[PDB]
Structure 1
Amino acid sequence: GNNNLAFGAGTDTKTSLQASVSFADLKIREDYPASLGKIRRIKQISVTLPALLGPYQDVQAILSYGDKAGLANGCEALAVSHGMNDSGQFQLDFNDGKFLPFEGIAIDQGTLTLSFPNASMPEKGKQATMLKTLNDIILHIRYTIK
Protein backbone atom coordinates (compact mmCIF):
# COMPACT_ATOMS: atom_id res chain seq x y z
CA GLY A 1 0.00 0.00 0.00
CA ASN A 2 1.06 3.55 0.83
CA ASN A 3 3.14 2.23 3.76
CA ASN A 4 5.58 0.42 1.44
CA LEU A 5 9.36 0.88 1.52
CA ALA A 6 10.90 0.68 -1.95
CA PHE A 7 13.38 2.43 -4.21
CA GLY A 8 12.41 5.32 -6.45
CA ALA A 9 10.80 4.96 -9.86
CA GLY A 10 11.57 8.15 -11.77
CA THR A 11 14.56 8.05 -14.09
CA ASP A 12 16.85 10.04 -11.75
CA THR A 13 15.59 8.33 -8.57
CA LYS A 14 16.40 4.64 -9.14
CA THR A 15 19.21 4.91 -6.57
CA SER A 16 17.05 6.84 -4.09
CA LEU A 17 15.24 4.86 -1.40
CA GLN A 18 11.95 6.36 -0.19
CA ALA A 19 9.76 5.30 2.75
CA SER A 20 6.09 6.15 2.20
CA VAL A 21 3.61 6.67 5.05
CA SER A 22 -0.16 7.00 4.71
CA PHE A 23 -1.75 9.70 6.86
CA ALA A 24 -4.99 7.70 7.16
CA ASP A 25 -3.09 4.70 8.55
CA LEU A 26 -1.41 7.02 11.09
CA LYS A 27 -4.77 7.21 12.98
CA ILE A 28 -4.08 10.70 14.35
CA ARG A 29 -7.61 12.09 14.02
CA GLU A 30 -9.13 9.83 16.71
CA ASP A 31 -6.44 10.74 19.26
CA TYR A 32 -8.76 13.59 20.34
CA PRO A 33 -12.56 13.65 20.65
CA ALA A 34 -14.48 15.01 17.67
CA SER A 35 -16.24 17.54 19.92
CA LEU A 36 -12.95 19.42 20.28
CA GLY A 37 -12.73 20.15 16.55
CA LYS A 38 -14.23 18.94 13.29
CA ILE A 39 -11.16 19.67 11.13
CA ARG A 40 -7.49 18.86 11.77
CA ARG A 41 -4.73 20.45 9.69
CA ILE A 42 -0.95 20.10 9.61
CA LYS A 43 0.92 23.25 10.64
CA GLN A 44 4.54 22.03 10.61
CA ILE A 45 6.42 18.76 10.07
CA SER A 46 9.76 18.01 11.74
CA VAL A 47 11.89 14.89 11.21
CA THR A 48 14.57 13.26 13.35
CA LEU A 49 17.10 10.72 12.06
CA PRO A 50 19.19 9.24 14.90
CA ALA A 51 21.62 7.81 12.36
CA LEU A 52 25.27 7.38 13.36
CA LEU A 53 26.34 10.42 11.38
CA GLY A 54 30.03 11.18 11.76
CA PRO A 55 31.71 14.33 12.98
CA TYR A 56 31.40 16.97 10.25
CA GLN A 57 29.33 14.50 8.22
CA ASP A 58 25.63 14.72 7.53
CA VAL A 59 22.55 13.01 6.11
CA GLN A 60 20.71 14.20 3.02
CA ALA A 61 17.07 13.21 2.59
CA ILE A 62 13.81 14.82 1.48
CA LEU A 63 10.27 14.11 2.69
CA SER A 64 7.50 15.12 0.28
CA TYR A 65 3.72 15.08 0.08
CA GLY A 66 1.59 13.15 -2.41
CA ASP A 67 -0.88 15.74 -3.70
CA LYS A 68 1.37 18.67 -4.73
CA ALA A 69 -1.71 20.55 -5.99
CA GLY A 70 -3.81 22.01 -3.18
CA LEU A 71 -0.90 23.74 -1.51
CA ALA A 72 1.25 26.83 -2.00
CA ASN A 73 4.11 26.62 -4.49
CA GLY A 74 7.10 24.80 -2.97
CA CYS A 75 5.42 23.95 0.35
CA GLU A 76 5.05 20.27 -0.64
CA ALA A 77 8.56 19.09 0.23
CA LEU A 78 11.32 19.94 2.70
CA ALA A 79 14.79 18.40 2.81
CA VAL A 80 16.47 17.29 6.03
CA SER A 81 20.06 18.36 6.68
CA HIS A 82 21.16 16.91 10.04
CA GLY A 83 18.05 15.05 11.23
CA MET A 84 17.59 16.04 14.88
CA ASN A 85 14.24 17.84 15.25
CA ASP A 86 15.19 19.31 11.89
CA SER A 87 12.89 20.95 9.37
CA GLY A 88 13.76 22.14 5.86
CA GLN A 89 14.48 25.73 6.94
CA PHE A 90 17.43 27.34 8.72
CA GLN A 91 15.42 29.48 11.08
CA LEU A 92 11.76 28.57 11.30
CA ASP A 93 9.43 31.32 12.48
CA PHE A 94 5.74 30.75 13.13
CA ASN A 95 5.22 34.53 13.11
CA ASP A 96 6.45 34.85 9.51
CA GLY A 97 3.96 35.52 6.73
CA LYS A 98 5.30 32.50 4.85
CA PHE A 99 3.22 29.36 5.11
CA LEU A 100 5.50 26.68 6.51
CA PRO A 101 5.97 23.52 4.42
CA PHE A 102 3.04 21.12 4.81
CA GLU A 103 0.60 23.73 6.13
CA GLY A 104 -3.15 23.26 5.91
CA ILE A 105 -2.78 19.61 4.87
CA ALA A 106 -5.63 17.46 6.16
CA ILE A 107 -4.61 14.68 8.54
CA ASP A 108 -7.36 12.26 7.54
CA GLN A 109 -6.16 11.72 3.96
CA GLY A 110 -2.77 12.05 2.33
CA THR A 111 0.57 10.32 1.83
CA LEU A 112 3.99 11.32 3.19
CA THR A 113 7.12 10.02 1.47
CA LEU A 114 10.66 10.49 2.80
CA SER A 115 13.38 9.81 0.22
CA PHE A 116 17.10 9.07 0.66
CA PRO A 117 19.10 9.77 -2.51
CA ASN A 118 22.10 7.65 -3.49
CA ALA A 119 21.10 4.71 -1.31
CA SER A 120 21.98 1.73 -3.54
CA MET A 121 25.33 0.19 -2.64
CA PRO A 122 25.60 -1.39 -6.15
CA GLU A 123 25.98 2.23 -7.30
CA LYS A 124 28.23 3.02 -4.28
CA GLY A 125 25.81 5.69 -3.15
CA LYS A 126 27.14 8.22 -0.65
CA GLN A 127 24.42 7.33 1.88
CA ALA A 128 24.78 3.56 1.45
CA THR A 129 27.16 2.86 4.34
CA MET A 130 25.46 5.32 6.70
CA LEU A 131 21.88 4.31 5.90
CA LYS A 132 22.76 0.80 7.08
CA THR A 133 23.20 2.39 10.52
CA LEU A 134 19.69 3.89 10.34
CA ASN A 135 17.45 2.16 12.92
CA ASP A 136 14.23 4.19 13.18
CA ILE A 137 12.62 7.38 11.86
CA ILE A 138 10.68 10.02 13.79
CA LEU A 139 8.27 12.66 12.53
CA HIS A 140 7.22 15.49 14.86
CA ILE A 141 3.81 16.39 13.43
CA ARG A 142 2.75 19.88 14.54
CA TYR A 143 -0.98 19.88 13.81
CA THR A 144 -3.68 22.27 14.99
CA ILE A 145 -7.34 21.66 15.87
CA LYS A 146 -10.05 24.12 14.85
Structure 2
Amino acid sequence: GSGNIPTADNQLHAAFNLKALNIKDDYPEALGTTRRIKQISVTLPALVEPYQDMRAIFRYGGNSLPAGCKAIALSHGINDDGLFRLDFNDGRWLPFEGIPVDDDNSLTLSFPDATGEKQKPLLLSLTDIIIHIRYTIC
Protein backbone atom coordinates (compact mmCIF):
# COMPACT_ATOMS: atom_id res chain seq x y z
CA GLY A 1 0.00 0.00 0.00
CA SER A 2 1.46 3.32 -1.14
CA GLY A 3 -0.40 6.51 -1.90
CA ASN A 4 1.29 9.39 -3.75
CA ILE A 5 2.47 6.93 -6.31
CA PRO A 6 5.21 8.55 -8.42
CA THR A 7 0.98 -2.39 -6.91
CA ALA A 8 0.39 1.09 -5.50
CA ASP A 9 -2.32 0.17 -2.97
CA ASN A 10 -4.23 -2.55 -4.80
CA GLN A 11 -3.84 -1.01 -8.27
CA LEU A 12 -1.10 -0.47 -10.84
CA HIS A 13 0.04 3.01 -11.80
CA ALA A 14 2.24 4.50 -14.53
CA ALA A 15 4.15 7.79 -14.49
CA PHE A 16 6.13 9.82 -17.04
CA ASN A 17 7.19 13.43 -17.39
CA LEU A 18 6.54 14.46 -20.99
CA LYS A 19 9.55 16.80 -20.87
CA ALA A 20 11.61 13.60 -21.02
CA LEU A 21 9.70 12.50 -24.13
CA ASN A 22 11.45 15.20 -26.26
CA ILE A 23 8.53 16.63 -28.20
CA LYS A 24 10.51 19.82 -28.85
CA ASP A 25 13.42 17.75 -30.21
CA ASP A 26 11.12 16.00 -32.70
CA TYR A 27 10.67 18.86 -35.19
CA PRO A 28 12.60 22.11 -35.80
CA GLU A 29 11.55 25.21 -33.91
CA ALA A 30 11.29 27.30 -37.10
CA LEU A 31 8.04 25.47 -37.91
CA GLY A 32 6.11 26.65 -34.85
CA THR A 33 7.00 28.05 -31.44
CA THR A 34 4.18 26.30 -29.54
CA ARG A 35 2.98 22.70 -29.62
CA ARG A 36 -0.22 21.60 -27.91
CA ILE A 37 -1.75 18.16 -27.43
CA LYS A 38 -4.98 17.50 -29.34
CA GLN A 39 -5.88 13.81 -28.86
CA ILE A 40 -4.41 10.89 -26.93
CA SER A 41 -5.20 7.32 -27.96
CA VAL A 42 -3.90 4.20 -26.20
CA THR A 43 -3.18 0.73 -27.60
CA LEU A 44 -2.58 -2.16 -25.17
CA PRO A 45 -1.81 -5.33 -27.15
CA ALA A 46 -2.43 -8.01 -24.51
CA LEU A 47 -4.00 -11.45 -24.77
CA VAL A 48 -7.61 -10.83 -23.75
CA GLU A 49 -10.07 -13.56 -22.82
CA PRO A 50 -13.04 -13.16 -25.21
CA TYR A 51 -15.89 -10.87 -24.13
CA GLN A 52 -13.91 -9.14 -21.38
CA ASP A 53 -13.28 -5.44 -20.91
CA MET A 54 -9.98 -3.94 -19.73
CA ARG A 55 -9.62 -1.82 -16.60
CA ALA A 56 -7.46 1.24 -17.21
CA ILE A 57 -7.61 4.92 -16.28
CA PHE A 58 -5.42 7.57 -17.90
CA ARG A 59 -5.01 10.96 -16.30
CA TYR A 60 -3.16 14.29 -16.37
CA GLY A 61 -0.98 15.02 -13.36
CA GLY A 62 -1.15 18.80 -13.19
CA ASN A 63 -4.14 21.13 -13.02
CA SER A 64 -4.62 23.60 -15.86
CA LEU A 65 -7.28 21.71 -17.84
CA PRO A 66 -11.10 21.83 -17.73
CA ALA A 67 -13.05 19.86 -15.13
CA GLY A 68 -13.55 16.44 -16.66
CA CYS A 69 -11.03 16.97 -19.44
CA LYS A 70 -7.99 16.03 -17.34
CA ALA A 71 -8.90 12.34 -16.94
CA ILE A 72 -9.92 9.70 -19.47
CA ALA A 73 -11.01 6.09 -19.17
CA LEU A 74 -10.25 3.03 -21.29
CA SER A 75 -12.46 0.22 -22.57
CA HIS A 76 -10.68 -2.61 -24.40
CA GLY A 77 -7.13 -1.63 -25.34
CA ILE A 78 -6.55 -1.26 -29.06
CA ASN A 79 -6.63 2.35 -30.35
CA ASP A 80 -9.50 3.21 -28.03
CA ASP A 81 -10.57 6.69 -27.05
CA GLY A 82 -12.35 7.08 -23.75
CA LEU A 83 -15.34 8.18 -25.81
CA PHE A 84 -17.47 5.99 -28.04
CA ARG A 85 -18.05 8.54 -30.80
CA LEU A 86 -14.98 10.36 -32.12
CA ASP A 87 -15.90 13.73 -33.63
CA PHE A 88 -13.71 16.83 -33.61
CA ASN A 89 -16.77 18.98 -34.44
CA ASP A 90 -17.97 18.74 -30.83
CA GLY A 91 -17.43 21.95 -28.90
CA ARG A 92 -16.78 19.81 -25.89
CA TRP A 93 -13.00 19.52 -25.95
CA LEU A 94 -11.29 16.22 -26.41
CA PRO A 95 -9.69 14.88 -23.24
CA PHE A 96 -6.10 16.10 -22.88
CA GLU A 97 -6.67 18.94 -25.35
CA GLY A 98 -4.71 22.15 -24.88
CA ILE A 99 -1.81 20.60 -22.95
CA PRO A 100 1.47 22.42 -23.62
CA VAL A 101 4.26 19.98 -24.39
CA ASP A 102 6.66 21.44 -21.83
CA ASP A 103 5.94 20.00 -18.39
CA ASP A 104 3.50 19.64 -15.45
CA ASN A 105 2.42 16.03 -15.90
CA SER A 106 3.44 12.84 -14.21
CA LEU A 107 1.76 10.76 -16.91
CA THR A 108 -0.87 8.87 -14.95
CA LEU A 109 -1.95 5.62 -16.59
CA SER A 110 -3.75 3.85 -13.74
CA PHE A 111 -4.82 0.21 -13.64
CA PRO A 112 -7.40 -0.54 -10.93
CA ASP A 113 -7.29 -3.94 -9.19
CA ALA A 114 -3.99 -5.30 -10.47
CA THR A 115 -4.11 -8.15 -7.92
CA GLY A 116 -4.86 -11.84 -8.46
CA GLU A 117 -7.99 -12.10 -10.62
CA LYS A 118 -8.83 -12.23 -14.33
CA GLN A 119 -6.92 -8.93 -14.72
CA LYS A 120 -3.62 -10.44 -13.53
CA PRO A 121 -2.85 -12.67 -16.57
CA LEU A 122 -4.11 -9.77 -18.68
CA LEU A 123 -1.63 -7.22 -17.32
CA LEU A 124 1.01 -9.95 -17.02
CA SER A 125 0.78 -10.79 -20.73
CA LEU A 126 0.76 -7.09 -21.66
CA THR A 127 4.19 -7.05 -23.29
CA ASP A 128 4.22 -3.29 -24.00
CA ILE A 129 2.18 -0.13 -23.58
CA ILE A 130 1.64 1.85 -26.79
CA ILE A 131 0.16 5.35 -26.84
CA HIS A 132 -0.81 7.59 -29.76
CA ILE A 133 -0.53 11.32 -29.09
CA ARG A 134 -1.92 13.73 -31.66
CA TYR A 135 -0.73 17.29 -31.18
CA THR A 136 -0.95 20.66 -32.90
CA ILE A 137 2.00 22.80 -33.97
CA CYS A 138 0.78 26.38 -34.15
TM score, norm. by length of structure 2: 0.91
Does residue 41 of structure 1 match 2:32?
A: no
Q: Percent identity?
A: 56
Partner residue in 2 for 1:118: 113
Query: How many aligned residue pairs are there?
Result: 134
Give yes or no for the alignment of 1:89 onto 2:65. Answer: no
SS at match of 1:119: coil
How far does residue 126 in structure 1 lie from its aligned partner after superposition? 4.2
Residue in 2 aligned with 1:22?
17
SS at match of 1:129: helix
> Paired residue for 1:104, among 98, 101, 116?
98
- Structure ranking higher on relative contact order (CA contacts 8 Å, 6+ apart): 2
CA–CA separation in structure 1 for the residues paired with 2:28 and 2:56:
35
Cα-Cα RMSD:
1.5
Q: Where in structure 1 are there 5+ consecutive unaligned residues?
A: 1-6
Moved over 4 A (4+): none
Question: 1:8–1:51: structure 2 CA closer, same or farther, 3 Å change rule?
Answer: farther
Note the C-alpha offset of 1:58. Answer: 2.0
Compared CA separation, residues 87 and 119, structure 1 to 2 (3 A): same
TM-score by length of 1: 0.86
